[model samples]
Target: GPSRVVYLGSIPYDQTEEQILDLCSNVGPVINLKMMFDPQTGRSKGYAFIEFRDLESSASAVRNLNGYQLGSRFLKCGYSSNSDISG
Candidate 1:
């Protein structure tokens, strides 16, 4: 893959893909963005997945945005884990 995907948690419920792009695009070019939603309620699941152009961009996003606050929430950014436990 040409991009590296990162897991983003603790996102503000009101956040949008455009807002995420604004936050992460500062680090590097974003290739893809997915904001999770609850299947039942169709509401935000409070998380997202972001794919950047390269590993450096992904790392930069995590380094800069992890623990970053958006509204009342502190965002958590990291590599998408393969384990059963989600970040």
Candidate 2:
């Protein structure tokens, strides 16, 4: 399902998923947005998940955002099709 989506992860603590979505969606359509945080710690797990409506846009997002620094750290983007279970 190329029209399906992929996931991006390992984002920094300070950035929100919406920021990622806005950035990526500028390239194409964004499907889902998730910012992972530890409930116990109330801090980000240093990552997030983003789903693009199209695979080509997802690839484009990864290519453009990965290793690109936003604020203090470079974004680590990837194609993960698994659900993240964080409690």
Candidate 3:
């Protein structure tokens, strides 16, 4: 699947996901957005997996957005470890 998914983390729970897409749009086209939350507690995990249209764009996002400050937390961007988890 090429995946093209970036492991983005330490994001702003209040204005990320779709809002974060706005930021990545400058670097590349976002294909998908994955948010982490506790199934029981229903609290945000404050991290996500962002899928770009291609590997180059996903890699660029990791390089460019790694240190972006969002709500006092700097972004931690990298290649996602696993993408097979049920969403």
Candidate 4:
């Protein structure tokens, strides 16, 4: 009935939510996006968590976006352990 939050890995360390929005929207409505940041450097941590407004978007990301080559690394997509996943 809903989309589960998913993890996007190997993301660019300089990535931003805006950039994520630009790319992710092609698949579906993006629910929420967050980038892990380094407290010391105040920079992104090369990975992020994403949630979609619909079921198709979430699975589509995992299936189609996984291994997508972006800049220096291939994108990695998978289920998130976020509590919201089971909710």
Candidate 5:
């Protein structure tokens, strides 16, 4: 079975995907990583999504990474798969 896609939050505004992977990998194997950014300013939106190969890994990521501060900001991790589509 495959795990569903989920979104993480409260990431540092300057952190990158590599950083996310590096942090989350300490908990478990990170299957996929994506850091959201502002298209106009090219800045990190202080959030990202990480999907693991298994549910156990996802839970491990959430447990270890949530509320963890990266640089100057504390990360808020959770499960979300909603698309940012509003018009």
Candidate 6:
């Protein structure tokens, strides 16, 4: 059932999963969210993987969020190329 996942990068290192959900959920329903973090300090790795409810939602998120700047970082949003995760 893997589908509708977007790869987001160039994110603020201090951003959180809740913040990401807030930013992207406006485009569509977010089914799941994962933001990588350093195990030692629990700091963000500056990227995330977001799963939306459907392909349309994923495309909408990418179109609306990509290159949008937040704080000092510009978001890089797009369909994930990872075969294992993408639909």
Better of 4 and 5 by TM-score: 4
Q: Evaluated with lDDT, which candidate comes out highest? A: 6
Q: Once superposed on the true structure, which residue ranges of model 2 sit more than 4 Å away at CA?
A: 1-4, 83-87
Q: Summarize candidate 2's per-residue lDDT along 1-87 as a digit string, tens digits.
A: 343454555566777666767777786787777767899988878776677787788888778877877777777776776558989
Q: Rate the local accuracy (lDDT) of all candidates.
A: 0.84, 0.72, 0.81, 0.81, 0.75, 0.87
Model 6: pairs clashing at backbone N, Cα or C within 3 Å: none
Question: What local lDDT does model 1 show for residue 77?
Answer: 89
TM-score (C-alpha, index-matched) for candidate 5: 0.78
Better of 1 and 2 by lDDT: 1
| Candidate 3: stretches off by over 4 Å | 1-3, 83-87
Summed over model 2, clashes come to: 1
Candidate 4: regions farther than 4 A off: 1-3, 83-87
| Candidate 6 per-residue C-alpha lDDT over 1-87 given as tens digits, one digit per residue, 9 for 90 to 100 | 335999989999888888888988888999988888999998989888999989999999898889999889888998884636556
lDDT of 2 at 9: 58
- Residue 18, model 6, lDDT: 87
Q: Which candidate is the best by TM-score?
A: 6
lDDT of 3 at 68: 84
Instruction: Give one digit per residue, the lDDT tens place, for model 3 in 1-87.
Output: 544888888887776456777887888988878888879988778888788899899989988999988777798888875637676
lDDT (tens digit, per residue) of candidate 1 on 28-76 = 8989888899999888888888889888999888888899988998889
Question: What overall lDDT, based on C-alpha atoms, would model 1 receive against the true structure?
Answer: 0.84
Candidate 4 on 1-87: residue-level lDDT in tens? 344677888988777868877778787788788878889988888888888886778898898779998888899998776344553
lDDT of 2: 0.72
- What are the TM-scores, per candidate, against the unseen true structure? 0.81, 0.75, 0.78, 0.83, 0.78, 0.86
